[PDB]
Design a protein around this motif. Structure first.
Motif, PDB file in Angstrom:
ATOM      1  N   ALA A  67      -1.529  31.456 -10.011  1.00  0.00           N
ATOM      2  CA  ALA A  67      -2.170  31.030  -8.763  1.00  0.00           C
ATOM      3  C   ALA A  67      -1.279  30.045  -8.102  1.00  0.00           C
ATOM      4  CB  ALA A  67      -3.519  30.407  -9.044  1.00  0.00           C
ATOM      5  N   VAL A  68      -1.340  29.966  -6.775  1.00  0.00           N
ATOM      6  CA  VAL A  68      -0.399  29.199  -6.007  1.00  0.00           C
ATOM      7  C   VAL A  68      -1.017  28.415  -4.894  1.00  0.00           C
ATOM      8  CG1 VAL A  68       1.795  29.269  -4.852  1.00  0.00           C
ATOM      9  CG2 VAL A  68       1.227  31.090  -6.418  1.00  0.00           C
ATOM     10  N   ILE A  69      -0.609  27.163  -4.802  1.00  0.00           N
ATOM     11  CA  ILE A  69      -0.889  26.346  -3.618  1.00  0.00           C
ATOM     12  C   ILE A  69       0.445  26.066  -2.934  1.00  0.00           C
ATOM     13  CG2 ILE A  69      -1.688  24.123  -2.850  1.00  0.00           C
ATOM     14  CD1 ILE A  69      -3.542  24.148  -5.270  1.00  0.00           C
ATOM     15  N   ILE A  70       0.473  26.336  -1.631  1.00  0.00           N
ATOM     16  CA  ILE A  70       1.612  26.008  -0.828  1.00  0.00           C
ATOM     17  C   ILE A  70       1.241  24.834   0.052  1.00  0.00           C
ATOM     18  CG2 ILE A  70       3.146  26.764   0.988  1.00  0.00           C
ATOM     19  CD1 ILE A  70       2.178  29.559   0.363  1.00  0.00           C
ATOM     20  N   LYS A  71       2.129  23.858   0.123  1.00  0.00           N
ATOM     21  CA  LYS A  71       2.019  22.717   0.978  1.00  0.00           C
ATOM     22  C   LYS A  71       3.210  22.711   1.899  1.00  0.00           C
ATOM     23  CE  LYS A  71       3.250  19.162   1.860  1.00  0.00           C
ATOM     24  NZ  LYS A  71       3.770  18.595   3.127  1.00  0.00           N
ATOM     25  N   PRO A  72       3.073  23.313   3.052  1.00  0.00           N
ATOM     26  CA  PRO A  72       4.233  23.386   4.008  1.00  0.00           C
ATOM     27  C   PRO A  72       4.625  22.048   4.627  1.00  0.00           C
ATOM     28  CG  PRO A  72       2.477  25.007   4.510  1.00  0.00           C
ATOM     29  CD  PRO A  72       1.870  23.924   3.617  1.00  0.00           C
ATOM     30  N   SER A  73       5.854  21.903   5.004  1.00  0.00           N
ATOM     31  CA  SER A  73       6.339  20.655   5.626  1.00  0.00           C
ATOM     32  C   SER A  73       5.629  20.480   6.982  1.00  0.00           C
ATOM     33  CB  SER A  73       7.833  20.710   5.814  1.00  0.00           C
ATOM     34  OG  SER A  73       8.324  19.531   6.465  1.00  0.00           O
ATOM     35  N   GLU A  74       5.085  19.297   7.202  1.00  0.00           N
ATOM     36  CA  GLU A  74       4.512  18.856   8.514  1.00  0.00           C
ATOM     37  C   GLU A  74       5.578  18.872   9.647  1.00  0.00           C
ATOM     38  OE1 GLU A  74       3.797  14.485   8.108  1.00  0.00           O
ATOM     39  OE2 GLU A  74       5.568  14.567   6.790  1.00  0.00           O
ATOM     40  N   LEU A  75       6.856  18.692   9.352  1.00  0.00           N
ATOM     41  CA  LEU A  75       7.854  18.651  10.431  1.00  0.00           C
ATOM     42  C   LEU A  75       8.017  20.033  11.107  1.00  0.00           C
ATOM     43  CD1 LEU A  75      10.725  16.248   9.223  1.00  0.00           C
ATOM     44  CD2 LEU A  75       8.367  15.690   9.706  1.00  0.00           C
ATOM     45  N   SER A  76       7.660  21.144  10.445  1.00  0.00           N
ATOM     46  CA  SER A  76       7.649  22.454  11.060  1.00  0.00           C
ATOM     47  C   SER A  76       6.196  22.933  11.305  1.00  0.00           C
ATOM     48  CB  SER A  76       8.420  23.386  10.167  1.00  0.00           C
ATOM     49  OG  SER A  76       9.805  23.175  10.513  1.00  0.00           O
ATOM     50  N   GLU A  77       5.599  22.382  12.357  1.00  0.00           N
ATOM     51  CA  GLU A  77       4.165  22.348  12.540  1.00  0.00           C
ATOM     52  C   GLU A  77       3.591  23.719  12.872  1.00  0.00           C
ATOM     53  OE1 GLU A  77       3.369  18.663  14.838  1.00  0.00           O
ATOM     54  OE2 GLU A  77       1.402  19.486  15.361  1.00  0.00           O
ATOM     55  N   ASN A  78       4.301  24.484  13.697  1.00  0.00           N
ATOM     56  CA  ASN A  78       3.821  25.795  14.106  1.00  0.00           C
ATOM     57  C   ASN A  78       3.781  26.766  12.933  1.00  0.00           C
ATOM     58  OD1 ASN A  78       3.613  25.502  17.158  1.00  0.00           O
ATOM     59  ND2 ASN A  78       5.550  24.637  16.704  1.00  0.00           N
ATOM     60  N   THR A  79       4.827  26.706  12.143  1.00  0.00           N
ATOM     61  CA  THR A  79       4.937  27.500  10.965  1.00  0.00           C
ATOM     62  C   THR A  79       3.867  27.147   9.951  1.00  0.00           C
ATOM     63  OG1 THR A  79       7.335  27.801  11.252  1.00  0.00           O
ATOM     64  CG2 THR A  79       6.414  28.352   9.166  1.00  0.00           C
ATOM     65  N   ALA A  80       3.688  25.860   9.702  1.00  0.00           N
ATOM     66  CA  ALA A  80       2.595  25.411   8.826  1.00  0.00           C
ATOM     67  C   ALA A  80       1.239  26.009   9.238  1.00  0.00           C
ATOM     68  CB  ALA A  80       2.536  23.895   8.832  1.00  0.00           C
ATOM     69  N   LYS A  81       0.925  25.949  10.520  1.00  0.00           N
ATOM     70  CA  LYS A  81      -0.346  26.477  11.019  1.00  0.00           C
ATOM     71  C   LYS A  81      -0.398  27.970  10.897  1.00  0.00           C
ATOM     72  CE  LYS A  81      -1.625  23.471  15.090  1.00  0.00           C
ATOM     73  NZ  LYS A  81      -1.366  22.202  14.352  1.00  0.00           N
ATOM     74  N   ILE A  82       0.685  28.685  11.231  1.00  0.00           N
ATOM     75  CA  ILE A  82       0.593  30.121  11.115  1.00  0.00           C
ATOM     76  C   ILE A  82       0.419  30.576   9.629  1.00  0.00           C
ATOM     77  CG2 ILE A  82       3.017  30.842  11.034  1.00  0.00           C
ATOM     78  CD1 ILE A  82       0.247  32.409  13.186  1.00  0.00           C
ATOM     79  N   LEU A  83       1.057  29.884   8.703  1.00  0.00           N
ATOM     80  CA  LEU A  83       0.828  30.151   7.254  1.00  0.00           C
ATOM     81  C   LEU A  83      -0.625  30.020   6.852  1.00  0.00           C
ATOM     82  CD1 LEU A  83       4.087  28.739   5.668  1.00  0.00           C
ATOM     83  CD2 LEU A  83       3.331  31.115   5.808  1.00  0.00           C
ATOM     84  N   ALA A  84      -1.247  28.935   7.273  1.00  0.00           N
ATOM     85  CA  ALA A  84      -2.659  28.682   6.965  1.00  0.00           C
ATOM     86  C   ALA A  84      -3.575  29.721   7.612  1.00  0.00           C
ATOM     87  CB  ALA A  84      -3.065  27.249   7.376  1.00  0.00           C
ATOM     88  N   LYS A  85      -3.181  30.235   8.764  1.00  0.00           N
ATOM     89  CA  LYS A  85      -3.985  31.241   9.414  1.00  0.00           C
ATOM     90  C   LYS A  85      -3.768  32.633   8.794  1.00  0.00           C
ATOM     91  CE  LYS A  85      -5.241  33.277  13.785  1.00  0.00           C
ATOM     92  NZ  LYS A  85      -5.046  33.272  15.243  1.00  0.00           N
ATOM     93  N   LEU A  86      -2.515  33.017   8.532  1.00  0.00           N
ATOM     94  CA  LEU A  86      -2.295  34.416   8.066  1.00  0.00           C
ATOM     95  C   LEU A  86      -2.537  34.682   6.593  1.00  0.00           C
ATOM     96  CD1 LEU A  86       0.847  35.307  10.176  1.00  0.00           C
ATOM     97  CD2 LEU A  86      -1.469  35.912  10.595  1.00  0.00           C
TER      98      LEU A  86
END
Lengths: 458, 461
Positions: free
Chosen positions: A132-151
């Motif tokens: 099982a995996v938790i990903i914590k994307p970097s806040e400095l790449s904000e659009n990408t972080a949000k699209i990951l959480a959405k898709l």
């Protein structure tokens, strides 16, 4: 709150449902579908985060991710199977094998510079290993972080594989929770904090960190070719790459021709008006813009050096005759400035590299094969490319990782699978042949000892 | 003090002396020579620490060490060579390989229970990988600590490979220094400390820790064989072993017959008067001796229980119907007590294991191979032996190490070499074919992206 999310993902792992091969294969197919069906959204988010063209996002990030999914989908059935090992005299007739198994819950902490590759590529391996995996994307790449959480929730199992967004404070709280593995890409200082948090729970870590990747240029070689390869690797993503050539070491008299050929290459790659190139990115934020500007103070600029705060533009730049004690040679540049530090010969270059922390990458340009072997044999780095930059990254068969300050552990292809697995050795005997064991049981005797000398030693 | 010692070892590493294969081979030969020429000294030292017979020290420790040296002397010329790897379409005309290199200076912290194996076995691997090495032997095995400090500088390079003796506070100072890898065997709580110190310098670690290695006995088995094997592995070294079976899980109705068969085996192994047997060791000190005694309070002793403080003797002991909340079931026994925790069936045994920390070993006794494979797939542990105990330790082929709280990393044979090396990937290109690289160079274009999808992702069409 961080505690609840971890408990949810742990419970999903403990259900057993990610253990079977077929489930894992389905999740990788789903990830592939995600990247195919939602390509336009993904490209748009990364492009906005780095001011990068969609062409370049596709070729650098998407193609790498798609290649890694196909490679796992093709080899994973072989990777999960138990592997027989060579037995010894005490165990000749038993079954012995090494069987991989999941670690449990893996935390991936993403970097900002290639924010899709540096989260998704490790994920692929973690998924493939049954975790099982938790990903914590970097806040400095904000659009990408949000699209990951959405898709991700739209394609992958929602409870086994999750995205948690946030900054330093949220990451600190998440690092108090218990994971079975932590994978971090970023910088040395935060690597220590990760490792210190892992220490609290004896969690194994993989840390992909940075440094200053040197690039040695020998006189015995064609500088037209050398300089094109270097220019590509230096100025891609505005130099915001761990694997970028950070600086050049070479004999002082090469300087002029190097400067000239990089300048000519910059013009072919980016045109006359570099600010208009769709191919040349921008510095990620204002803090980094200012950091990189400060490295310019006091230096001799051979060309470039134009900046623009409002768009975070810094032009491709080369500095000559650089003194190793100045700021530009005392931290990782992670921007579009290439210093040249003169060295009289290869011994001086090797000594220079050796006094510094072990870089992620080392690059050596020469037709002289002995020179390249000396350089390799007498230095230590995460990886090496001779006569190019960057490309060693692209082989699935290589472990990609650092050593010393540029990190510990490695991944890509099978190395990802192994990094997120435990290789468990299993020796299965039968309840027969008990008479033989008398040799190992007490009482001991000179004769039993001699048995051992004769059968166990040469 | 430690600062200066480490700097000396580092300077010797930086000389390059340990890099050539020939030099590493010499050092391992010198080491084998030390074990052969000074065997009697070595046996006496270990024998005194553990009150152990020279035959047992020889067969448990010295053989293992010599076996590891012979394995390395034979395979090492192959291990150090560059290994070609599988290339891809962009790199097929190039040279690509992985080459092993030393990490730098390695720190080995030893444990007291097998004090020669647990120092020297890691050392062999670290030498073989080209490192400089500092060994810190455990204070608790005092005779062995001193003989290592005396012998090693008479056979090995005196600057590349040193011994530093001391206890907690010198270890604490030593752990402030910068190493390239730290290798520790011991317990969970010191492991955390070692990892915390390593975190200060981003030093990778290998940690061989412990836990309660369970032992499941299925009713479908030959109990006479099962009990002999468990008896052997439980009471070797007085149960002062990380891989000893810590406790038993079985159906309650087997308990009487397990107890009776262990008792008859103990008589065969150690005789009627176990205190006189030269094959039964003693507890390492008074602290551990009292720790073990406290685990007997409140328990039903089915067999054994005799103790003697003055010689640190605790007889082979078996407890029945043990309640898993009692103290015996809440810490690593590391002693000659074997608790039996009844479970109705294999599912209850699997759940019991899975609710606890992942142990270093797991042992399963059954004629039924499906059930053994089932217990393996539904649990996790560092290693597994089915139908025996301990023996998985002995294959050079196997990585030996824990997982979760029983540790991280692994060693033995080629796994030691790998643990103490960096595997460095090298891709060597020519300056040819520069025109072809336009594919990857800016300016980018729809045509280049489409050619990448066609050719690199193999989509036609």
């Amino acid at each position: 709150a961080m505690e609840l999310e971890v408990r949810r993902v742990r419970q999903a792992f403990l259900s057993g449902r990610s253990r079977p091969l077929r489930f894992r294969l389905q999740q990788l197919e789903a990830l592939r579908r995600m990247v195919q069906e939602r390509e336009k959204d993904i490209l748009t988010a990364i492009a906005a985060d780095l001011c990068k063209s969609e062409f370049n996002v596709y070729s650098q990030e998407v193609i790498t991710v798609l290649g890694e999914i196909d490679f796992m989908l093709e080899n994973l059935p072989e990777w999960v199977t138990a592997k027989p090992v060579k037995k010894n005299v005490l165990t000749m007739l038993d079954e012995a094998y090494i069987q991989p198994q999941p670690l449990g819950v893996v935390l991936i902490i993403g970097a900002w510079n290639y924010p899709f590759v540096l989260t998704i590529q490790p994920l692929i391996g973690a998924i493939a290993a049954g975790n099982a995996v938790i990903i914590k994307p970097s806040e400095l790449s904000e659009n990408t972080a949000k699209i990951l959480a959405k898709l991700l929730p739209q394609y992958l199992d929602q409870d086994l594989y999750i995205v948690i967004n946030g900054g330093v404070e949220e990451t600190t709280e998440l690092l108090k929770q218990r994971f079975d593995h932590i994978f971090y890409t970023g910088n040395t200082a935060v690597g220590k904090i990760v490792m210190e948090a892992a220490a609290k729970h004896l969690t194994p870590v993989t840390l992909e960190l940075g440094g200053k990747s040197p690039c040695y240029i020998d006189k015995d070689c064609d500088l037209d070719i050398v300089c094109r390869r270097i220019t590509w690797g230096k100025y891609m993503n505005c130099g915001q790459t761990c694997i970028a050539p950070d600086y050049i070491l070479c004999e002082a008299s090469l300087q002029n021709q190097i400067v000239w050929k990089i300048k000519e290459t910059v013009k072919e790659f980016y045109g006359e008006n570099i600010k208009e190139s769709p191919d040349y990115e921008r510095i990620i934020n204002l803090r980094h813009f200012k950091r990189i500007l400060s490295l310019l103070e006091g230096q001799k600029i051979a060309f470039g050096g134009e900046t623009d705060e409002a768009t975070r533009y810094i032009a491709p730049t080369v500095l000559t005759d650089v003194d190793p004690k100045t700021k530009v040679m005392q931290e990782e540049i992670f921007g579009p400035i290439l210093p040249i530090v003169p060295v009289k010969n290869v011994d001086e270059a090797i000594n220079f590299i050796n006094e510094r922390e072990k870089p992620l990458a080392l690059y050596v340009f020469s037709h002289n094969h002995k020179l390249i072997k000396r350089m390799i044999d007498e230095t230590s780095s995460g990886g090496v490319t001779g006569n190019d930059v960057i490309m060693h990254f692209t082989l699935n068969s290589f472990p990609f990782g650092g050593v010393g300050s540029s990190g510990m552990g490695a991944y890509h292809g099978k190395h990802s699978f192994d990094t997120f697995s435990h290789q468990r050795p299993c020796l299965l005997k039968s309840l027969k042949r008990e008479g033989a064991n008398k040799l190992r049981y007490p009482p001991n005797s000179q004769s039993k000892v001699d048995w051992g000398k004769f059968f166990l030693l040469k």
